[model samples]
Every structure is written in C-alpha cells, then in structure tokens.
Target: EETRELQSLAAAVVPSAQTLKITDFSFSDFELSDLETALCTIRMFTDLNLVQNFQMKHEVLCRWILSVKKNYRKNVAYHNWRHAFNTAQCMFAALKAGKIQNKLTDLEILALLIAALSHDLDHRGVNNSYIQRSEHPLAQLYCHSIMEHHHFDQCLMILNSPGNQILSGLSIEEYKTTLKIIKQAILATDLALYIKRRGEFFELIRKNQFNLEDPHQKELFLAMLMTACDLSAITKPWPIQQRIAELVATEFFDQGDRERKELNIEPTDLMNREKKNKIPSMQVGFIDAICLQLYEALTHVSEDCFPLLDGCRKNRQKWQALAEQQ
Candidate 1:
C-alpha cells in the first residue's frame, strides 16, 4: 500500500513532457497536500527508493522539515517552503546532469537531498544585513553567517530532541559522523561562504583528488552541486528564471525598505520607497550578469545546461532593449 501511494505521488509530480516552468509542477495532485505531507513523501523517497528500507536518517529528515514548516514564520517574502522545494528541484537537476561523482554512496546522496530541503528551514525573512544591524543573537552566534548557523543549529537540535530522537536510532559513533557531515553541508550553503569555497570545489573535482571509490569525495562532490544550485537561478528556463529574479529583487527591495525606515531616510529608489526597487532596471543588470556567467559556466559544465543559458541571455537582451525604449 505504501509503495502504491508513493508511486501515485511520483506520477502526480511528473511534469508534462513539454512543461518547462518549475511552478507548473504542483503538489496538489499528490497524495501529500501540505508542506508536512510533502516532506514525509520526500523521506519516503529516501528510504524506499534510495536506501531500500526505512532508517533513522528518514526520521531525522522528516522531523527537520516539519519543524521548519511549523516554526518558521517569515511569509512576506521568498523565504518559504516554495523556495525549499525549488532548491530540491535544482539539486535533482544537477544530479541528473552527471555533475556528481560516482564515489558517493546512496546514503550520501540521500543525506544531501535531506540537507537541501532543510538548509534554509527557519528563515527569518530578513537577510544577514538585518541581523547585523539589529545586533541579532544569531549574527553573533554565527559570526555573521546568521542564517546558515541558525539553520544548522536548529536541525541539530531537532535531531537530538527527545521527542524526535532521529539520531538515537543510529549507533553513537555513526550518529556523530552523520551529524557532523550534515551540519558541514548545511552550513556551506551560506552564500558568503559559497563565494569563497566554489573555486576550491571545482578545483578539487578537476584535480581528481579523490577516487570514485572514496565516499568522502562523493559527499564533497554532491555538496558542491548543492552549492551550484543555490546560485543556479540563471540556469532555469526564462520564465522560471524571471520569477526567481523577481523574488530576489523583491527581497532586496523589502530589505531596502526596512533599512530606510530604521534609518529615517527617505525612500530613494523604487526598491526602498514604493518597494519597486526599479526591478526592471535591476533585473536587466542581473539578467545580463547571469547570462554571461551561466553561458560560460554551462559551456564548460554540460551542453544540456546551455539551453537555459541561451534562454536567459535572450530574455536579458530583450529586457534591455525594452527598458531602453522606456
């Protein structure tokens, strides 16, 4: 019965052959309805499909996702389950692209997926700048990597909680290893760190530092793929790419507004004042940058990713021309 239900869920999520937009993939038709249900479904996938059985890992992942959905209160912006789902989608895409090394075990891949879903579990709707400005405890605790630190701590706390007991099911040593690895991967998602670590990740892959048989190499490879997706907005279809850009622009504008209010400053740009942030203007710049980066990056990574790059560039040029006319 469980197998049948999971099959139904997968079938429901399978995109139509021609569907290109990520938003077009809906969870309404799946047996799972809410974020919690969808999270459980993901756990089920890790257990049944990947590991061939249920394990403590599944328990830990489910608890983490549920905790985020329940306790995370930021709803005004893009820091939501939809963003989490989108990250998962991008990670899956990278996996399918053969970007991952074969040295990783099924367990590592499962853990990476779990990490992706729970990485931003408890976003406060405010960026690190706000945390720094407000002197938020998280800013101090994380040393300015506020979101990453908070998320890792939150997931660890839940996994260790008596009611959750996610890691309790594992041997003490195994539990320690899993916790450490998961925390490292999750914290690495902080874009501040990403900008520093990405070169190393690619270099290691290019150098063949680890053999295909080494599990550590596999884990690191997948971790880098996770990083790639976190910056992969430019690699999505034009429509989907536009939506992501808009969400980011909205986040910037919202932040600008908050800063303006706190500083008693007049709203200067559409972003700070009317929440417009002159997005069309910003989008043109961002889209152009994304195109240049993705086009070169994908040309080296894989041809399959090139279509996205092409579409992004085309849309960017079109937007630029339209803006000039205005």
Candidate 2:
C-alpha cells in the first residue's frame, strides 16, 4: 500500500519537467514552488553531470527526487520541501559557484547533495532536546542524534521504495559507501554534533594540517562541508538571509510555546516568544558562535569559498545594525 502511494506521488511530481530546464538559478532568493523546486533538483544533478556519472535512468532519478520530496512534511514552517531544496542549492553553489568541486569526487558530491535534501525529513518543528524532554518514543530509539537518526531512516525509506531507486545503477561497493557517506553527512547537520566536533575541525585548519588524502581527515572535511551547505542560508544576501531567520524564529517560537505549555519549562532565548525584539541580537550571537567561524574555516579549504564568508560578513553587519537599533 505504501509502495503504491509512493509510486503515484512520484508520477505526480515528475510531470513539469521540460518546462523549467533553466538550471542556473538565484540561490539567494529561493522563491520556487514545489514543481520548480523538483526541476531545479533535477537540473542541479544534471548540470553536475551526476546523471551521466552513473548513467542513472532519467525517469528513475526524477522519481527518486519526487519520492524524496513526498517524504518531507509540508506543515512545518522552516524545515519543509523548500528548505530541503535550498539546502541542496546551497551545496550546489559551494561546489559549483564556489569552485569547491575540485576538492570532491563526483560520488561524494552526489551523497552530499542527497544528504542536504534529506537531512531534516518530517521534522516536527522541535529540536532533539525537545524529543528527549517530551520522552518521545523516537528519543529512545537513539541515545544520541535522535531526530537525525529518524531522518536518515526516512531518507532510506524513500530511496528503497520501488519507484525511487536512483542509485540502482551503482556497483555493490559504490552503493554501500554512498549510503555510509550520506548517513554521516546527514548526521553532521545536527547542531549538537557540529558543536562537539567543530573545535577539532577548526584546530586542524588553523594548523594547516588538513589533509584530504587521509581517510579520517577526508571524512571530517566532508562532514564540515555538509554543515557549511546546511547552514548556507547564513551566507545569502541580507534580505533573504534576514527573511530566512524570521521563519526560523517563528518555528523556534512555536517550539517554545510547546515547551512552555506542554512541558512546563521556559524555553531559551532562541525559542522564547516574549524575547522577540532581542532576536536580532541573538542572531549576532549565533553568527559569532556558528556562522562566522564555520564559513571562515571553509575559506581555508578554498579561497573561492570566501564568497560565502563575505556574504556572511555582510549579513553580520546588517544583523549587528539591527541588534544595535534595539
């Protein structure tokens, strides 16, 4: 029954294909509808020659994208289909526009973009902490990376569905490794995980000891790339970046309401609604803590990644100004 439903969903999403082949898109203003988003995903994979890399069936790939889209919950404000598409586009820009493509294999790029799209599948507008605090059954499933584990499982469910075997053409070894990397990349999007590991990542970059040839180092690098791409909204133009933050705050406040009402706990500044006027300042702290450093370290990998850093810097200034206005 589930299989039949997924097949119909894929069939529905794959139709508007030929209409929007314009692959090069404005990443900053991600004002794409679901149909255009699907086409853009296809175009990104096509432009990157990933479709050719494995001789993947065109229809099957489209089916897989549509199936993936179906798995993302639509009701959530921040972590919906558009956010997934934007995350993939962010990866697209980092690799193509930022010229970080030379640093990765075609296979790696495929996994990264797939992970970006699937990282937050069916998110319920709450954090992992909330899942644990609420004693949600999902939290008991994984002691760590609770929500991310569910997301990865959801991603696999879509990929393994009959109509969605986009990776069907790969060798057994390639298939195994691709799945492994995708899981790792998806988990890397968890902010807690990034916070735990980023110190070492930044330390390596500072010492200029980052060597991609080392397998362990390569994994760390790929993980950081996942974060860089996942949080790429921080590097968007001021208007769009600010706008994205607004949605995020809305989502956070919704979670805060749940925390206060259901759990009887006061939420942090991030999730607190009464603290709304202070969000721009909180955003500065966020930029200082997460965005600025993440992009800064990425530039060490390739100066071409500096556009991301420059965008972040400009946004930080705008955010700081708003912070000061209060």
Candidate 3:
C-alpha cells in the first residue's frame, strides 16, 4: 500500500465505525519515578524469574535497574525511561495477562525483557534517518542498524558494569545465547528491520508453518513480538493512546525542529511542524499500514492475546474518527 494513499484514505472514513463500549485493562496509569515503582520493577524481575533463572542477585538487580533507568537522558521528549518502562510493561502484561509465556523460554523471556527495557538507551529523541542525514557519529559506527547497535553496546556496558552486574551468574553458553537474543530483539525494534522481515513472518503464520523450535523461526518470532510491544501504545485504552500519540508527535516535531535548524533541510511531513494538522491522519495511516496487520498476525499466533488485537482495532477506529472530525 502506498503511504500517501493510505493517509488520504484514513482521512476518508465512514459513519458507524464509532464503537459503543467494552471492558478492558489499563497498564497506562503507573508512574515510574516513585519508590514503589522501583519495588514493582524488581518484582517484574523476581516474578518473571529473571533473578532465579539466571541466579542474578536481588541487590544487583536493584542497582542495575536504577542504573539502567538513569542512563536514559532526563530531557528526551519520548525515548526516555518512561517509554522503555512502558515497552517492558507491555511485554510483562502480555506474558502475564496474555498467552505468550508458553511460546518463549525463560532465557528468551529474560532477553526480551532486557531488550525492551534497554532498546533506546540514551536515544536523543531523534531517529535513524535523522542520524544518517546529519552524519552523526552513531551513523558512522555501523553500516546498518546504527542506533540499535549503539543501544546494544550500551546495554552490554551496563550489564557488565560493577554495580549493574545483573546478568553475572549466566554460564558462558547461556550468556552467549541470551545476549544474541537480546541483541536481535533490540535490533528488531527498528522499523526497517520490521519492514524487511514482516513478510516472511506473516507468510509462516498465515500458512500454519511457524515452528518456534526452529532457531531461525524462533528468532523471527522474537523480532515480531518485540515490534508489537514496542508500538503497543496503540493497543492501550483510548485516552492513554491519545496522550501517548500526542507525546510522540511532540517528540517527533521536536526532532523536526532540530533538523530544520541544524541539518538545514526540510524534514519529512511526518516530522514537519507546519503540517501538524495531518497528525491524526498520519497516525491512522500508521495503524493501517503497520499496527493493524501486526496485531492480526499476532492474534493468530496467540488468541489469548486478542485483547491487544482488540485494543489496536479500537484505537484504529478512534484515530479514524479523529481523522474525519479534523
């Protein structure tokens, strides 16, 4: 589907798509900066067996969580600890309230949890193309997947640091395997990676041939799951979803401003400030082009995870409503 066509099409909806009402869960009301949040954060590790499975120490877990949270820049508009926490929280919610647990190994779960938490460590509120266009040093470090490679490097540094030795107890083999999963899961967050791999992912699922035991297929599973969680804000309640949309748009606009001033180039409309009225339609296009099919394929994989699919569909309708009204 062409991007502009879908965007215009979103601006072109019909009546009766408005939802009446339905029951739902809200994971959007927590504050991450409180002491209780820290306790709860540790509990995710404990309850999820990241501690017991890896033999990681409780005190070290505390230190590592604090340090990891600290590493996210204080001033970032969107790619901050809150975003990371919410990403991990979506993964946590799916594993608990949904049916993804049976689909993953304990080590795989640990890797994904860590990957979700640290995926955008120190992100500057800008994106890869911005980095690439500006000739930023991060763009120079890797020929591809530049930002995520830096994130993985930062993740490794934190885990290896003295106070943050949270993965210390892994055997050589387990550590190696989990680290690969973590890197893959983290790297998979890139939309480009998702774009490249999504066709294969759905083909396997749609054909009923998705064998998770096969190593490559399992990695593909991890990749797609990471995307669902990374962009799961669309699967939240309406108010929460709308507010997140605003925050992310604000962050994106901020990046566009930087590009205008520093890079001295006209930013893409997705980031352009003057075209801000198009936000709703652009978000609708985002759901249609990216989120819609993802939650669909995901639903086929885990029907118990249907709430996520349901939530996404609801948001898509809600966003379409906004698109028409505006």
Highest-lDDT candidate: 2
Which candidate do you rate higher for TM-score, 2 or 3?
2
Better of 1 and 2 by TM-score: 2
| Predicted structure 2: clash tally | 0
Tens-place lDDT digits, model 1, residues 240-259: 66676677667767777777
TM-scores of all predicted structures: 0.68, 0.88, 0.86
Model 1: lDDT to the true structure: 0.54
lDDT of 3 by residue, 15-39 (tens): 2201201112357634433343445
After superposing candidate 3, which stretches have Cα over 4 Å from the reference?
1-25, 29-32, 128-142
* Residue 226 alpha-carbon offset, candidate 2, angstroms: 0.7
Q: lDDT by residue for model 2 over 1-326, one digit each (tens)?
A: 64564454346543322344232223643556665677678777877788888787766877788778887777777888778888888788778767888878877888988898899998888764432222344543556677898999999888888857888888999989999999999988887677767888999999989888888888888888888877877777788887899888888888988879898999887788889889888778878878889999999888878888888888889989988994
- Least well predicted 10-residue stretch by lDDT in candidate 2: 16-25
Clashing residue pairs, backbone N/CA/C < 3 A, model 3: none
RMSD (Å) per prediction: 6.7, 4.9, 11.6
| lDDT ranking, best first | 2, 3, 1
TM-score of 2: 0.88
Give the TM-score comparing model 3 with the true structure, all chains together: 0.86
